[PDB]
Design an enzyme around this catalytic site. Sequence first.
Site, PDB file in Angstrom:
ATOM      1  N   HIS A 195      85.988   9.134  48.478  1.00  0.00           N
ATOM      2  CA  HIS A 195      86.389   9.263  47.070  1.00  0.00           C
ATOM      3  C   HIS A 195      87.919   9.271  46.879  1.00  0.00           C
ATOM      4  O   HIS A 195      88.350   8.790  45.827  1.00  0.00           O
ATOM      5  CB  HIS A 195      85.775  10.535  46.556  1.00  0.00           C
ATOM      6  CG  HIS A 195      84.290  10.374  46.275  1.00  0.00           C
ATOM      7  ND1 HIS A 195      83.647  11.038  45.258  1.00  0.00           N
ATOM      8  CD2 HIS A 195      83.329   9.663  46.908  1.00  0.00           C
ATOM      9  CE1 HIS A 195      82.354  10.696  45.259  1.00  0.00           C
ATOM     10  NE2 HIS A 195      82.164   9.850  46.243  1.00  0.00           N
ATOM     11  N   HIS A 225      76.554   6.006  54.516  1.00  0.00           N
ATOM     12  CA  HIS A 225      75.188   6.568  54.394  1.00  0.00           C
ATOM     13  C   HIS A 225      74.433   6.626  55.697  1.00  0.00           C
ATOM     14  O   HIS A 225      73.289   7.027  55.688  1.00  0.00           O
ATOM     15  CB  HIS A 225      74.407   5.947  53.226  1.00  0.00           C
ATOM     16  CG  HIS A 225      75.029   6.249  51.889  1.00  0.00           C
ATOM     17  ND1 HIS A 225      74.623   5.672  50.724  1.00  0.00           N
ATOM     18  CD2 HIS A 225      76.110   7.014  51.577  1.00  0.00           C
ATOM     19  CE1 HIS A 225      75.338   6.138  49.701  1.00  0.00           C
ATOM     20  NE2 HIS A 225      76.313   6.924  50.199  1.00  0.00           N
TER      21      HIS A 225
HETATM   22  C1  HEM Z   1      77.488   1.990  45.833  1.00  0.00           C
HETATM   23  C2  HEM Z   1      78.347   2.787  46.435  1.00  0.00           C
HETATM   24  C3  HEM Z   1      77.988   4.198  46.658  1.00  0.00           C
HETATM   25  C4  HEM Z   1      77.204   5.081  45.931  1.00  0.00           C
HETATM   26  C5  HEM Z   1      76.519   4.856  44.577  1.00  0.00           C
HETATM   27  C6  HEM Z   1      77.266   6.369  46.524  1.00  0.00           C
HETATM   28  C7  HEM Z   1      76.625   7.471  46.108  1.00  0.00           C
HETATM   29  C8  HEM Z   1      76.623   8.771  46.711  1.00  0.00           C
HETATM   30  C9  HEM Z   1      76.020   9.961  46.140  1.00  0.00           C
HETATM   31  C10 HEM Z   1      75.332  10.035  44.800  1.00  0.00           C
HETATM   32  C11 HEM Z   1      76.142  10.909  47.092  1.00  0.00           C
HETATM   33  C12 HEM Z   1      75.701  12.353  46.983  1.00  0.00           C
HETATM   34  C13 HEM Z   1      76.698  13.337  46.466  1.00  0.00           C
HETATM   35  C14 HEM Z   1      76.082  14.706  46.677  1.00  0.00           C
HETATM   36  O1  HEM Z   1      75.055  14.952  45.960  1.00  0.00           O
HETATM   37  O2  HEM Z   1      76.443  15.489  47.548  1.00  0.00           O
HETATM   38  C15 HEM Z   1      76.853  10.314  48.211  1.00  0.00           C
HETATM   39  C16 HEM Z   1      77.087  10.951  49.422  1.00  0.00           C
HETATM   40  C17 HEM Z   1      77.752  10.391  50.497  1.00  0.00           C
HETATM   41  N1  HEM Z   1      78.378   9.099  50.487  1.00  0.00           N
HETATM   42 FE1  HEM Z   1      78.045   7.684  49.171  1.00  0.00          FE
HETATM   43  N2  HEM Z   1      77.917   6.202  47.760  1.00  0.00           N
HETATM   44  C18 HEM Z   1      78.472   5.002  47.805  1.00  0.00           C
HETATM   45  C19 HEM Z   1      79.299   4.523  48.749  1.00  0.00           C
HETATM   46  C20 HEM Z   1      79.802   5.259  49.841  1.00  0.00           C
HETATM   47  C21 HEM Z   1      80.790   4.790  50.770  1.00  0.00           C
HETATM   48  C22 HEM Z   1      81.553   3.503  50.687  1.00  0.00           C
HETATM   49  C23 HEM Z   1      80.960   5.803  51.749  1.00  0.00           C
HETATM   50  C24 HEM Z   1      81.858   5.855  52.938  1.00  0.00           C
HETATM   51  C25 HEM Z   1      82.228   4.782  53.696  1.00  0.00           C
HETATM   52  C26 HEM Z   1      80.078   6.890  51.333  1.00  0.00           C
HETATM   53  C27 HEM Z   1      79.833   8.049  52.076  1.00  0.00           C
HETATM   54  C28 HEM Z   1      78.964   9.059  51.648  1.00  0.00           C
HETATM   55  C29 HEM Z   1      78.690  10.200  52.568  1.00  0.00           C
HETATM   56  C30 HEM Z   1      79.187  10.424  53.958  1.00  0.00           C
HETATM   57  C31 HEM Z   1      77.932  11.043  51.787  1.00  0.00           C
HETATM   58  C32 HEM Z   1      77.332  12.343  52.205  1.00  0.00           C
HETATM   59  C33 HEM Z   1      78.072  13.605  51.776  1.00  0.00           C
HETATM   60  C34 HEM Z   1      77.523  14.893  52.440  1.00  0.00           C
HETATM   61  O3  HEM Z   1      76.955  14.852  53.540  1.00  0.00           O
HETATM   62  O4  HEM Z   1      77.913  15.929  51.795  1.00  0.00           O
HETATM   63  N3  HEM Z   1      79.347   6.512  50.258  1.00  0.00           N
HETATM   64  N4  HEM Z   1      76.980   8.987  48.007  1.00  0.00           N
END
Ligand code: HEM
Lengths: 713, 713
Positions: free
Chosen positions: A77, A244
Amino acid sequence: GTSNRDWWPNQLDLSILHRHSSLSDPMGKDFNYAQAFEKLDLAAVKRDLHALMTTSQDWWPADFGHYGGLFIRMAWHSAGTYRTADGRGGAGEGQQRFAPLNSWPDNANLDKARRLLWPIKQKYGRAISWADLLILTGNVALESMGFKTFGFAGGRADTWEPEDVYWGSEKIWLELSGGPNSRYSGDRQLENPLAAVQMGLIYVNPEGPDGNPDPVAAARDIRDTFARMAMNDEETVALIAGGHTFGKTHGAGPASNVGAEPEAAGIEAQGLGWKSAYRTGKGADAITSGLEVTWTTTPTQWSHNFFENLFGYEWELTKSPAGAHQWVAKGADAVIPDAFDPSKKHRPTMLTTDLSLRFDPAYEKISRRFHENPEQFADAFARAWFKLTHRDMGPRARYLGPEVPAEVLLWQDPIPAVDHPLIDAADAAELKAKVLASGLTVSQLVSTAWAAASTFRGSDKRGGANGARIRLAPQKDWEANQPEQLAAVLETLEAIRTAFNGAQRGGKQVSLADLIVLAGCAGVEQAAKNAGHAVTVPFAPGRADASQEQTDVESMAVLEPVADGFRNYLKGKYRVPAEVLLVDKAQLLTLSAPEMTVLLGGLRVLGANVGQSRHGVFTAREQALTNDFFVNLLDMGTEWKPTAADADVFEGRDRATGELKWTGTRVDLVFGSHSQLRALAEVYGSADAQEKFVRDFVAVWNKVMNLDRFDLA
Amino acid sequence: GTSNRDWWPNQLDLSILHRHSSLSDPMGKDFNYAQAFEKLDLAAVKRDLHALMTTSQDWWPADFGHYGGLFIRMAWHSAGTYRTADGRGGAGEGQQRFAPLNSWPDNANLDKARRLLWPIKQKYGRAISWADLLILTGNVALESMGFKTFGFAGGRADTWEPEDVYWGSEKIWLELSGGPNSRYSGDRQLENPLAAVQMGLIYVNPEGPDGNPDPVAAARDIRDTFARMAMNDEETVALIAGGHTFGKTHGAGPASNVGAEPEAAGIEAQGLGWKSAYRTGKGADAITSGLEVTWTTTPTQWSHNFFENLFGYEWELTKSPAGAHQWVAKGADAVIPDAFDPSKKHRPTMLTTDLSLRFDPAYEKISRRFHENPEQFADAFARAWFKLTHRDMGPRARYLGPEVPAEVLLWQDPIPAVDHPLIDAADAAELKAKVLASGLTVSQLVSTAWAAASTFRGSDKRGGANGARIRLAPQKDWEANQPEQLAAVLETLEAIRTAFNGAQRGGKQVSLADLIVLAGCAGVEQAAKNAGHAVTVPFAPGRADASQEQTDVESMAVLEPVADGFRNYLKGKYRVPAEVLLVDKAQLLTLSAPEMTVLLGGLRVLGANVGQSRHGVFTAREQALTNDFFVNLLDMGTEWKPTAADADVFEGRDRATGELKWTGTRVDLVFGSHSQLRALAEVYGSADAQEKFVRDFVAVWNKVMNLDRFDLA
Ligand code: HEM
Ligand code: HEM
Ligand SMILES: Nc1ncnc2c1ncn2[C@@H]1O[C@H](COP(=O)(O)OP(=O)(O)O)[C@@H](O)[C@H]1O
Ligand SMILES: [Cl-]
Ligand SMILES: [Cl-]
Ligand code: NA
Ligand code: NA
């Protein structure tokens, strides 16, 4: 308390030009962050971060006993706000810790993630910026979980106030599209310069477009927004699936349990927000986005289980405990671990936007390749993660530390090393005389050097005259650069260059980049001499010439000036008044309001206007560096009225006779209308001001010529 | 474009502390206006202004062929925004040329007046500021029309952006009382710090209170607003009657003919506004206030006709051509000249607020005395005009030029001249040792010096430690100053003083004012020693001691701190949150946000709180100069919650045990909550920051101690 913005909500706002003053900066005026960083024991910082990853705090317990997923989301972010249209956003200033970004709904609970890092920030102090630490923490998370990163550069200095960024015109967080302030029009066309679908999102809505859980439609929004963040299909798939691979979402109960974002919270929350009344409010009970998905069987270890699950199951539409749309694997066994209870397991789940990677046909091809070849996946993700986190850092000369990748990447707009002696002051004087003896005019020399240097923007530190990219596609053909006129100038300078370089000994040579700038310097000196003033304009050599093969034409498109008030140029009719676009360009240039004013008034009388337009050329000695723009603009003997042909062009007539004296645009006449700008114009239009105007003009010209000179920092 | 103020309209605004940066100022950082002014040919400027008086411009023709009335009004409005409550407003920064004041309804057509002055301003350039020019112009208008002024001082440096002043909370120009944002409550009690009756007025409504034409009621509002501008009844009558000896009002047709104020007008208007569609829109047809009154038979000459007319006729209520309430002399002949047509004469007329001077019984006695003794009137008006136009200029040391009155006036808070040798460095060392040997504590020394110096406000340059007024009424009795503790410290210092002074030769002596400050410096030195640091604190001698008879006790009342966050003091419960009041105070002290931050954290650990309050005393080594405030405030091991007894006091308990560790106020905790403030606190609470904290604290302490030192400027 009622403010000027309340009374006159559409008057131009100059405060954007006066951010980042020495008043708001707690560090001394001599503080040099690079020098502090260069002595940081980076390996020690990384060891502390590695330890932190598995040291859970009870105020925000670590999912799976590991904070890595949280920190990867944090760093994504931080970088994810970037927009190519203007270079604004990105991780480079550490702006996640300030309003509004610290309280965007998509940044919920990242306040927790930053607070976890205070002990390390506190230990290392000024030697590591928050901006570098956010990124470094994401890289250490990745490393700790078995993923080999491509590298890391320090050098992002901290900032101390929010940037003024246009994030959209909606007055409601997360408003769906089609409202009175809709950022969409036409067939789902997102307004420039925006790069997110809803106010307060990073990119897209994880449920689907305006909440509609259709992976195919969501893919459109992913592709559009990621392209507006400088990422292509391969990079996009690598990023989303890479991210993810790790961690989980948080949606354990209804979102109505979640309280005020940080900027709205009470003083006792001490800069945290989103306090939750659901159960313990944290850990197993956490609510962040409202979704409750855990992607892989090993959320704390790099794997290729994301694509195994994406392709190995069919998916059913379901709802989280907060009511959000999400997907669950049909018929699956409970193979996904729970974050806190080792006796509980869960079925595989996915977001709508994860399924886009399989259901969009172009994504699906890449995703299949990555599933069949996880080593290809890993390398693409590494490369994309470096790009994501460094895209706003600027030239490679700004990259600090022992983990800078040696590979030069095309997206960096690279400049070749200089491997020869540079021209000295006597050589520079010889070249300036040769340039003036060629017959090139003050106007041609000023206009060429302006065109080359004024592509810089401080938002992402792209552009500027280094590289001599003005001679290449696409710069050489931009309308604002006057392609035929430019080609003629460049041919002349290239001949002078050839002649000087062929005469040298010992390998000394001058680059075309340096000579374009030097030639502009000669133009400004000549204009000063035309006015009766002998001045030397400073020049610093050391720029190099980039090749066409080192220049990404499609990436360079966003740097085209479609509005350049310094050259009285507008490529078409826009919604936003031209004076607003002037101040926006001035901010990109890093100019103050005084700097903007002196520069513009001098350019007008040097002949810098595109097309040789007479608008704003309020002098009878064009190509002489005088303050005539201001003395004539401010002359009450002239009355101004909009023309019948065009409401945006004005005629200045003698008040007593009606005789036509001048024409001007909104950009010219704002200097005589806006009460702050008019006060600046008055200083330079005073009878005592000719020396001051010349000196200040020279200084701002030199500043512009040097904006991209991080080799000299 | 949605901004942070839109999303979080009640978050604290720190931008007020970072106005007036070097970024917005077109002059060099070394520009010194006093030195420019001192070389101005003031006599030449006065000749040009005398010429201008009768040089009518067709775009705003001069009434009676003489602009003197317009210019008098212009200068009286420049000055007339002043408020004694905070010292804000006044002529001293030339703020009439910026928003909002350039567009207040009461400043209508003063845009014309300023524009008539541009040629003179242009001619003399930086050597005369706009702020000085506006007042000088008023003076020359009076002199031109036969009135001998008391004097004039230059030295009002120009400013370059609007000041952030609270002018009220109404959202409608001129709104009458009792609305949702009423500035009145109770028995027509005007809210502090305001000094006008309606948004956009200088003092009162010329038709009467809320438009009701009752001269007796109007007089109550005149008396209150003028008292809030530092004027008593004699001064008030002299000013109103003196002003209204000249010129006329303008209300030739309905107000609905008048267009946009300057900040709303079109770009073609080039900084002017209130364009009128009524007839020729100017001159004989002018509409400014909507009233149509000409007070005397010779409007362009000093006379005693105002009081002849006031007392010599009975008055009837009537309406102007725009419909405004005004008064006409019953049975009178047409004796008042027309401004443009020699064949027209008019009956005497008056405003409601002029009739207040006869129908309020206290004003009537002064009015009569001035009618019977016109020389008394003339002298009172001259003195009041000088006060009005200089009230915000500060100490007489700042007054520049050859027309400064030699007479010292009580309202100037005069400081005696020093006529003896000052203490040197060896003497300062001897006095500091005596002070530390007396048994005075760090807390007592710091608190005393703080109390003495922190009365300064930059808005009107009143207050500060010069004069040793802390020993006099009323400062010695203010609650915030801890009267009993103060008296014991002062008695000890006065004994040291007497002993040192009695031992000297050659006339050397130390003032109490200097000793207070020096003893505070010794306290800071001792606190640094208590922390292990070897620090010398700068001290500049040269303060003198003022007498009680040189100290007007009622005028000093407005300097009483009813909120002083630096000492965690609030005199009562207010509608404004304490942290907004802290920022307000910082602004008055001229502090940036980093300076406010370091200062507050240091004062807390030195024992400067009123009453030895523990609130914010986040240290176990009180009276040692350390960064403990920051390190403890930022410790996430402590959780904070408001107390049951008081929502404005907070308890910080250990997160793991529940045990109480500290208590704090809103002013303490805002440093851990506000996202910009907390970024500053982080710097000073870092492991590398102890020496930085100490040095910065010393610098800001020294700054505060010297705020009023215009003898050294
Ligand atoms: C279409 C693009 C993306 C969407 C819509 C999206 C959406 C989200 C959402 C809704 C969450 C959950 C937030 C929460 O409830 O804690 C999340 C978590 C996460 N996203 Fe994404 N994401 C996107 C792209 C990315 C990218 C590019 C990365 C890194 C290269 C990333 C890494 C993560 C990680 C590591 C988590 C887990 C956080 C945790 O373990 O607390 N995401 N994502
Ligand atoms: C109760 C306090 C006062 C009230 C309500 C008041 C009201 C006004 C009004 C309504 C006008 C007419 C504006 C227009 O239509 O052009 C005016 C004019 C003027 N006032 Fe006052 N006034 C006050 C005090 C002052 C004082 C203290 C001075 C100066 C010492 C002053 C000097 C003038 C002069 C010279 C004019 C004539 C302007 C011209 O000739 O263009 N007034 N006043
Ligand atoms: N005007 C002075 N008189 C006596 N000592 C001084 C003076 N100014 C600075 N010093 C000393 O020099 C030290 C560092 O000086 P400096 O480099 O000027 O930075 P700063 O603005 O922190 O004072 C200070 O902490 C103080 O102890
Ligand atoms: Cl930004
Ligand atoms: Cl002010
Ligand atoms: Na950026
Ligand atoms: Na003031």
